[PDB]
Amino acid sequence: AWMRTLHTTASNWLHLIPQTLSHLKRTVDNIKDPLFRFFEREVKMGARLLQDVRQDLADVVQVCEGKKKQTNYLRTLINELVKGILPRSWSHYTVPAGMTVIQWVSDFSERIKQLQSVSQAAASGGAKELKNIHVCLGGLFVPEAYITATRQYVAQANSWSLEELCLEVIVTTSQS
Amino acid sequence: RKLRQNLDGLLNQLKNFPARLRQYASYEFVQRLLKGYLKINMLVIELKSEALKDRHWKQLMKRLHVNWVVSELTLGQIWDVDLQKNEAVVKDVLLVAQGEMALEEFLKQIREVWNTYELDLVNYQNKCRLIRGWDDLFNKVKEHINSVSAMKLSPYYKVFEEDALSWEDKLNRIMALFDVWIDVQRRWVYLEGIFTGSADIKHLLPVETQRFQSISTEFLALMKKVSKSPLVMDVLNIQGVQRSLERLADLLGKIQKALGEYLERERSSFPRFYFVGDEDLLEIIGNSKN
Amino acid sequence: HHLQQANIQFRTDIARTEYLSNADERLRWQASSLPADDLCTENAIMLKRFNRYPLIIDPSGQATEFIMNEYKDRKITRTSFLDDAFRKNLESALRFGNPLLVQDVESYDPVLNPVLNREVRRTGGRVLITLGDQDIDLSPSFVIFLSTRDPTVEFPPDLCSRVTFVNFTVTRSSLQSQCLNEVLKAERPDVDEKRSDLLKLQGEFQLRLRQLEKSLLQALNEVKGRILDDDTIITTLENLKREAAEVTRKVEETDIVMQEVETVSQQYLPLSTACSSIYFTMESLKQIHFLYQYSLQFFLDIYHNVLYENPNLKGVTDHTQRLCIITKDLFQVAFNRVARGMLHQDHITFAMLLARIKLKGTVGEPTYEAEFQHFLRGKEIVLSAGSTPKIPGLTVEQAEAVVRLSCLPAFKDLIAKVQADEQFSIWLDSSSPEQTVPHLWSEENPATPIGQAIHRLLLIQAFRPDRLLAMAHVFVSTNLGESFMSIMEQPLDLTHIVDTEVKPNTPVLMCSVPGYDASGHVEDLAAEQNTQITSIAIGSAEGFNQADKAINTAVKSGRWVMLKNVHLAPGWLMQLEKKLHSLQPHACFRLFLTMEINPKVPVNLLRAGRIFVFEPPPGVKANMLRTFSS
Amino acid sequence: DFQAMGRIFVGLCQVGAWGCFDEFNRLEERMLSAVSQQVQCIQEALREHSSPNHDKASAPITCELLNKQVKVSPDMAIFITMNPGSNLPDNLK
Amino acid sequence: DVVVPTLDTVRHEALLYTWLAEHKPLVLCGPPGSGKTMTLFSALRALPDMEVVGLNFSSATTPELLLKTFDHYCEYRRTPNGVVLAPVQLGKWLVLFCDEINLPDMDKYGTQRVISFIRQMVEHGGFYRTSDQTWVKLERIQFVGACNPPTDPGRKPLSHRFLRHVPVVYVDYPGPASLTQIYGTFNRAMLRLVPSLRTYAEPLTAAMVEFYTMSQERFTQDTQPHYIYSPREMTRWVRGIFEALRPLETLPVEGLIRIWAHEALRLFQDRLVEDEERRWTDENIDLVALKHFPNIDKEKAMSRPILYSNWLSKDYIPVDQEELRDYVKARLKVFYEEELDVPLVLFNEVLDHVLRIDRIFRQPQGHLLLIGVSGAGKTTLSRFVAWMNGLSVYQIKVHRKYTGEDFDEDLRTVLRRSGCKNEKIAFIMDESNVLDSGFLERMNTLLANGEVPGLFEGDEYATLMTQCKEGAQKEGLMLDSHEELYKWFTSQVIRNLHVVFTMNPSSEGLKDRAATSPALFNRCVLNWFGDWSTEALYQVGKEFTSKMDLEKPNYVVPDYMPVVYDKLPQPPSHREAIVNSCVFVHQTLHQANARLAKRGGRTMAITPRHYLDFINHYANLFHEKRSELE
Ligand SMILES: Nc1ncnc2c1ncn2[C@@H]1O[C@H](COP(=O)(O)OP(=O)(O)NP(=O)(O)O)[C@@H](O)[C@H]1O
Numbered sequence A: 001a002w003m004r005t006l007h008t009t010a011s012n013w014l015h016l017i018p019q020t021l022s023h024l025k026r027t028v029d030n031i032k033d034p035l036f037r038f039f040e041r042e043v044k045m046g047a048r049l050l051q052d053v054r055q056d057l058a059d060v061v062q063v064c065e066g067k068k069k070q071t072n073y074l075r076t077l078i079n080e081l082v083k084g085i086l087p088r089s090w091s092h093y094t095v096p097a098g099m100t101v102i103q104w105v106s107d108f109s110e111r112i113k114q115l116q117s118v119s120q121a122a123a124s125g126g127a128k129e130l131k132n133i134h135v136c137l138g139g140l141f142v143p144e145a146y147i148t149a150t151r152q153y154v155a156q157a158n159s160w161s162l163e164e165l166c167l168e169v170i171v172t173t174s175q176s
Numbered sequence B: 001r002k003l004r005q006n007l008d009g010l011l012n013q014l015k016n017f018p019a020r021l022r023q024y025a026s027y028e029f030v031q032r033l034l035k036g037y038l039k040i041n042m043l044v045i046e047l048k049s050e051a052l053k054d055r056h057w058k059q060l061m062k063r064l065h066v067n068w069v070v071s072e073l074t075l076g077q078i079w080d081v082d083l084q085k086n087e088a089v090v091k092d093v094l095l096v097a098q099g100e101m102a103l104e105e106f107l108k109q110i111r112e113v114w115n116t117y118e119l120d121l122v123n124y125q126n127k128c129r130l131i132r133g134w135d136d137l138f139n140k141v142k143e144h145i146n147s148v149s150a151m152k153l154s155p156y157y158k159v160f161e162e163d164a165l166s167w168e169d170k171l172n173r174i175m176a177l178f179d180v181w182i183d184v185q186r187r188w189v190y191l192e193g194i195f196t197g198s199a200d201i202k203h204l205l206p207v208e209t210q211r212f213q214s215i216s217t218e219f220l221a222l223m224k225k226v227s228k229s230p231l232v233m234d235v236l237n238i239q240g241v242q243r244s245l246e247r248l249a250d251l252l253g254k255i256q257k258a259l260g261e262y263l264e265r266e267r268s269s270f271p272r273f274y275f276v277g278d279e280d281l282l283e284i285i286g287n288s289k290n
Numbered sequence C: 001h002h003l004q005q006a007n008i009q010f011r012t013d014i015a016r017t018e019y020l021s022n023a024d025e026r027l028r029w030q031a032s033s034l035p036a037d038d039l040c041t042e043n044a045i046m047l048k049r050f051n052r053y054p055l056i057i058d059p060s061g062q063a064t065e066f067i068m069n070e071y072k073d074r075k076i077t078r079t080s081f082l083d084d085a086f087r088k089n090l091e092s093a094l095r096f097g098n099p100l101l102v103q104d105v106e107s108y109d110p111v112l113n114p115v116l117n118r119e120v121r122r123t124g125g126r127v128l129i130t131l132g133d134q135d136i137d138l139s140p141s142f143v144i145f146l147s148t149r150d151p152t153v154e155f156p157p158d159l160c161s162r163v164t165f166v167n168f169t170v171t172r173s174s175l176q177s178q179c180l181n182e183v184l185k186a187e188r189p190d191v192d193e194k195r196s197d198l199l200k201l202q203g204e205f206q207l208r209l210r211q212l213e214k215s216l217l218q219a220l221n222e223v224k225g226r227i228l229d230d231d232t233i234i235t236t237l238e239n240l241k242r243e244a245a246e247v248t249r250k251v252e253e254t255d256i257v258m259q260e261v262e263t264v265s266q267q268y269l270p271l272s273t274a275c276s277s278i279y280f281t282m283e284s285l286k287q288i289h290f291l292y293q294y295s296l297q298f299f300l301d302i303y304h305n306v307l308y309e310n311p312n313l314k315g316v317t318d319h320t321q322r323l324c325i326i327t328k329d330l331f332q333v334a335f336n337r338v339a340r341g342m343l344h345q346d347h348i349t350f351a352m353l354l355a356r357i358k359l360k361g362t363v364g365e366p367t368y369e370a371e372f373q374h375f376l377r378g379k380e381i382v383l384s385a386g387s388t389p390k391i392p393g394l395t396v397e398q399a400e401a402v403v404r405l406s407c408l409p410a411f412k413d414l415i416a417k418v419q420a421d422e423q424f425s426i427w428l429d430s431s432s433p434e435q436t437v438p439h440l441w442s443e444e445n446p447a448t449p450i451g452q453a454i455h456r457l458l459l460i461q462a463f464r465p466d467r468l469l470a471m472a473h474v475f476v477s478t479n480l481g482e483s484f485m486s487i488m489e490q491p492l493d494l495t496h497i498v499d500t501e502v503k504p505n506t507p508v509l510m511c512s513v514p515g516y517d518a519s520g521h522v523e524d525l526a527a528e529q530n531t532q533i534t535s536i537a538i539g540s541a542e543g544f545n546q547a548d549k550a551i552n553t554a555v556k557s558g559r560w561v562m563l564k565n566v567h568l569a570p571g572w573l574m575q576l577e578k579k580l581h582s583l584q585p586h587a588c589f590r591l592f593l594t595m596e597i598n599p600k601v602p603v604n605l606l607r608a609g610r611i612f613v614f615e616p617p618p619g620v621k622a623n624m625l626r627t628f629s630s
Numbered sequence D: 001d002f003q004a005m006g007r008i009f010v011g012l013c014q015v016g017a018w019g020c021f022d023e024f025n026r027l028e029e030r031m032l033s034a035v036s037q038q039v040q041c042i043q044e045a046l047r048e049h050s051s052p053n054h055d056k057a058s059a060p061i062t063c064e065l066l067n068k069q070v071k072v073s074p075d076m077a078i079f080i081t082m083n084p085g086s087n088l089p090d091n092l093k
Numbered sequence E: 001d002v003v004v005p006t007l008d009t010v011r012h013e014a015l016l017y018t019w020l021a022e023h024k025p026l027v028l029c030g031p032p033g034s035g036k037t038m039t040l041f042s043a044l045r046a047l048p049d050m051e052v053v054g055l056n057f058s059s060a061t062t063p064e065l066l067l068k069t070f071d072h073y074c075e076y077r078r079t080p081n082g083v084v085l086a087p088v089q090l091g092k093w094l095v096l097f098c099d100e101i102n103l104p105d106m107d108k109y110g111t112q113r114v115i116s117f118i119r120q121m122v123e124h125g126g127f128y129r130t131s132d133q134t135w136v137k138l139e140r141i142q143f144v145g146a147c148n149p150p151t152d153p154g155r156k157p158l159s160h161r162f163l164r165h166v167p168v169v170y171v172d173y174p175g176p177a178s179l180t181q182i183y184g185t186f187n188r189a190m191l192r193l194v195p196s197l198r199t200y201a202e203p204l205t206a207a208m209v210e211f212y213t214m215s216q217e218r219f220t221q222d223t224q225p226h227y228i229y230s231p232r233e234m235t236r237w238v239r240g241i242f243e244a245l246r247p248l249e250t251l252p253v254e255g256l257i258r259i260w261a262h263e264a265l266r267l268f269q270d271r272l273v274e275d276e277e278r279r280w281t282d283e284n285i286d287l288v289a290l291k292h293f294p295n296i297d298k299e300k301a302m303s304r305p306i307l308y309s310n311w312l313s314k315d316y317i318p319v320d321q322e323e324l325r326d327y328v329k330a331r332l333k334v335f336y337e338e339e340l341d342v343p344l345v346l347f348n349e350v351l352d353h354v355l356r357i358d359r360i361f362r363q364p365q366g367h368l369l370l371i372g373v374s375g376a377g378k379t380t381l382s383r384f385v386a387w388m389n390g391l392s393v394y395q396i397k398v399h400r401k402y403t404g405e406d407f408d409e410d411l412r413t414v415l416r417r418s419g420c421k422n423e424k425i426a427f428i429m430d431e432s433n434v435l436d437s438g439f440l441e442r443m444n445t446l447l448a449n450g451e452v453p454g455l456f457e458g459d460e461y462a463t464l465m466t467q468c469k470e471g472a473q474k475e476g477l478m479l480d481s482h483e484e485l486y487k488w489f490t491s492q493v494i495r496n497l498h499v500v501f502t503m504n505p506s507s508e509g510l511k512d513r514a515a516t517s518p519a520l521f522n523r524c525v526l527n528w529f530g531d532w533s534t535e536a537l538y539q540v541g542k543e544f545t546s547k548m549d550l551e552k553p554n555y556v557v558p559d560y561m562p563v564v565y566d567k568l569p570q571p572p573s574h575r576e577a578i579v580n581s582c583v584f585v586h587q588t589l590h591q592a593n594a595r596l597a598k599r600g601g602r603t604m605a606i607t608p609r610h611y612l613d614f615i616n617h618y619a620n621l622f623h624e625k626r627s628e629l630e
């Protein structure tokens, strides 16, 4: 009966995660943008980890149906997933310690949706739209790189040295 | 095998008789007799086993209550003795024979190996030939001693007991020699590397130098004697080899202790030498004038 | 059933363990180190009637000792695959015929493939078998027993055909049967007699009945006209007149007795299921914290205390009251014994597990599988983006929680009821909401108190998770008693525990969080009991020698020994565990080991010891008091 | 080089000289435990200096090194660099 | 060995000459049996100047092999320019054949030593004599290699600094046109023996191609790892028909079709695992035959129980099932009391394996690969047929520290016995002693060519030449040249020495083999042993429990019985019902293990030896209990 419920759980987790993450189209013009470089690296890492998790969940669902036999790695994976433990094979970006799997896959879905949105924006309007998009730093695998990229973009635009730039924060409740 | 061939020929010959002759219960007796001989042909094969010896034939004679003579025994006497009924006794005796054959061939292996084992020797700086292959020698000795100790537990061990004990003694003596010998080698080699590499060590440690000279002469003579007869058993039978090697081990240990104490005294006199290795410190003190 | 379908005649009530072994052999096995169970007796029979050599899967390790004691007359010797001198020992055993036991077959060497397959090559009288380079002579007496301490192993199909398996592994049904037999022996010994007498209407009693005929016929033809010495030979003929009729009565009363033992054993079955569940929860405790390791001897000692050394059973003769008291004391003593060696965070977790076990085992209550499934995996339910509405007074997180809780059928009207409730906010901002949770779930029938408790638990999880633990405590109080958790909220009474519940060979492991020392408790106890105690600090190679000398003195003289800060010496602790396994300590001997909670302590030592977890009392006040005292 | 490490420790104690272990975490468990025991003995011998009752007119401090009583000079010291990810061995914490 | 000219061969030798004119190191890759080695050898030997040296690389090959080859064939000469290595024969270009460039093992740091050595030779035109520590230059030395693709398990990719110099060609399989041409030539040669069937050469050749291609399209490596096809199977087909036809003075067309179908079944239907695949092959053989041989009546030409054997009559002609059954039963009863005293039941699925093993023993270069469940007869049927056919059985005895030189010496001894002394040998190898794959690539040269160059190098060559000429004189042929004597020795090794590999199905993932190399599958004839069916269990049960008195004259047959054996005698008697129940035990246990696998539990392999042990225990227990009661 544990596999009867694990089948439904893994099916729901597969349904939640998007099937693919389109890779960004590198060109000569957009590579000069630090923002495009950061988002390309993020999309690469996210797509790789996405394929990893999707393959693992597909194998788990196949095992629960009897199609696939329980290998040692697979058996360890069922042991972790049934208990709600996050497998070591899934953690490749910094996350809270002791997190269950549902929170991890929900954060996964949010991150991949953000990556899809920014990739579509890049493909449609080029790298120029990467400045006007509102990026959730929580949804990035390394937001420090995003902060550095914003600093570099401001330096390139206004021709100032990077040392001479300092950060300020404005919290705006007004829409638009 | 030839007996089975002949019996099969006889049975096929019997099968060709006219049907009028066959309905009789007397043909039947002869056919049953040949069938029984075919059935006990397995035990006949097992009785030609080389495991059986005079003792096992005596055991068969006693248990089956038959006074056979091994040279004069014929196939018919074994045949007419009820081997079919008495198969349990035959199986027990041949089982005992198999066990004793196993132990006997193990002792044969010991005897052949240790009568054919030669101590390998490799030249060392054109001064003598030191023994090589200590790991193999000690592994073989350990294997044989453990195997004899395990053989002492075997249910069939009483027959070979005395012989086993003899080999046990020899095996232990062999270990009791070479466990010493490697030591008497190693220290000497070590001391040699210290007492001829540096020519100034003679002036620092004259008494230890003289003792090592008198020890090296004796060890070289012993190694020459071994080189003239590198067999393990020939070496073991050298007159007073064990006591001589124990004396050499004791004296080499004493000289190594004296050298270690002298080097430790030199280190404590100038404490920074504690950062310097043994060979480097020996180089430093020996080259005091260079 | 298939044999019955084919009209093949077979005994109806067959006992495998009785049909395949005489009582003398079973007595001999029990004289050896055989745990007397149905599974263990069947396994012991499998070690007697084997054609192929056996593979003994024994995580406990009892079966290796059983094989060793059985074959001691044949001079069996121990070996393992991992040992360097394994192949030569195997060669000697095969060559000379002594039996052998080989351990750690998880790393199965393939050189043993023909030996298990019996691939004898016959040449004259020399019967060779290949092993490595050599061709060695198979002695007739040779027998090998493969062993596995690991019960989680996947052997190759090559080895399975070459070996017959014998599983000495505790499972749910094995422990259930053991516990049920123990209860029937302890509380209804008449049914135990009528059960052992039902498996003695097989070979035992009839064998004795005709073994008496043997002595009769011995003393029947010893006659020369002196049969009528007094015409009182009938006594010898009357001793057989009784037993026959007796063993003719029981054969006639073999359906009434069978039905009676069935009816009486089903009564005591929920206790057995609770026992199995409790023990397997204690086994499950490993993956919560590395220290939470408890042997099966722990649970069986708990059960011996609960059945035989239970002061609450004194003066009670009705069997139903005794059963109820036994169940309650089982839960209570299990919780006390386990939680005395647990960190304070995990006490509520284990209490919740025991409460769930009782809820499974309690009569008249539904399992509440769906509600507990939502309690443990409610977050696993999916909320579509934008599907969460806004509710007056609830934050976003409480809104997601209520939306998830609305999936269950009882809480379907939860959102509307929450909106309509005027007094909701005062409950939501209350300091102790769990005591006054509002009634919001819809019920087709009035719910039991535990149903109300679990529904309140779900509501508190949804709205005020910060109080969840407190609510959880109430659930335990609703299921296992108000004073159930209270005994842990008290000072540790090491006196009675060490005097009664600790054997001399079981070391008392006092583990503390780092920076806290608990040797003062042992010193206070030694002062209270008026018992000489020798305390040694393990911090150097000398301390090992001092500890060995002190333990060798105290084990004979029955003194008390304390070893301070033993976590600094893991390997020496393994050596001490191996030493302790072999001793025959005096009754008054006790060995305390004080350590800090680290993962480098051996797992076996924790498994083979009484664990007591000490933590400082939280608070600034106690911290300042400790600092000033120090 | 372990086989000189006892000799090096005795040299540091006798002459007066510092010793710094760069990335002491990287020593394997056996190596870590043995060196930890040696440094623990040396540190206890050094800490014996600090007590006020011990008058240093006649105070031959000693430590057990290589099964001998080696005199420890006060100028000597030992340092242990570490790389987190982690903690110091329990002997020397 | 001179390749039949086909389109691929002419293309590849044209490219070979083009890339040898520049002295570039050619390399050829492709699937096993594609024909790269033969094309390379034929193209190289067609050139007048080229002197071919055939070196075969293995996992343990090093620069030492190439240096030894240079010392053998080449020599160092001092010149004013410098030290120059040159072939001893003036005006001849020495070309080294490296048959498996990929196979040498990489170091711990992912570099093949010999590949780097060859790289420095081809790129710098020389190397450093280490003994003299001086530079030397190659003058007329070349390299030309063959490979399998790096995806195969035993292979490795080559260094990119090395692959730059070598141009790599891919020799795929010939395809339908090339196969039709090649085997048209072969079958026109083969039918010259019987002059009435020449007209049926071309129709046959298409069939041998067509069915083969159909198999190549229907069965792939994905379904099973050993479903590999290549022209080696076609040459085995040609060889089988040739050996069938060689002693025959004449045939009709229908007998030729029957031999063709028999070889089809024995080469393709044996390797298959699933029963329905075997049915498909059964139908497709008939379809292809009736398509390419119209107006030939199927009933006479090909009856389903097709069997060919040589024991009944001196000629290799078809025989009936019953006569072969009786002969094999008599010889097996002889075998009981001759070499091994264990009963061996003949059932319908073991006589076929006896015939298959005998057939592969009669062919030249006949090597068998028996793959199947553990037990089931392999290593017992191979020994049995080897005893029947008089082949002295040789089995390798791998020790620890059993270096490749020891395997080399064992191969030398068996080769000397098989070739010089003309003593047929069945070289049995088992997965237990084939744990290391490093030595199993030395065997591939033997399986493909019958001679392994480099074995007898040195004085061993002189001794083997002496013994070889002695053997040739014994056979009546007077030979002088060493090359001709070596060729005759190779032919004798082809005729005499056979190899019988025994493996389990692809569950050996942990082993270094994993799935063993497809070259090994291609070189041998594969035979799927499988697991005993219901009929096999029934028959092996009846002939083991026939000595028991399981007879009941009053056995009331049930109105409706459950049956595992659909062909049970009806109405069944007591013995029949008991044996059917004994098979029910095995079937229910298999079902139970499958169910346990379904629920995720740890399963254990169930093999025929379980059934044999069950029947033995049943017999012993029946005898014991009946003796006790009597
Ligand atoms: N054109 C051809 N003419 C005749 N036989 C051929 C031809 N092409 C392939 N074969 C057969 O194909 C089989 C394979 O021959 P071979 O050259 O040894 O393959 P291989 O690829 O070298 N084996 P390997 O070296 O392990 O990869 C043999 O039975 C050949 O007779």
Ligand SMILES: Nc1ncnc2c1ncn2[C@@H]1O[C@H](COP(=O)(O)OP(=O)(O)NP(=O)(O)O)[C@@H](O)[C@H]1O
Binding pocket: C158, E342, E343, E344, E345, E346, E350, E373, E374, E375, E376, E377, E378, E379, E380, E381, E430, E502, E503, E504, E540, E609, E612
């Ligand atoms: N047809 C048969 N009838 C009766 N006994 C058989 C039969 N075939 C095999 N056996 C017995 O089965 C046992 C194992 O047979 P065997 O085929 O040698 O195992 P195996 O296949 O070699 N296992 P492995 O070598 O690891 O692949 C032996 O005791 C054989 O005598």
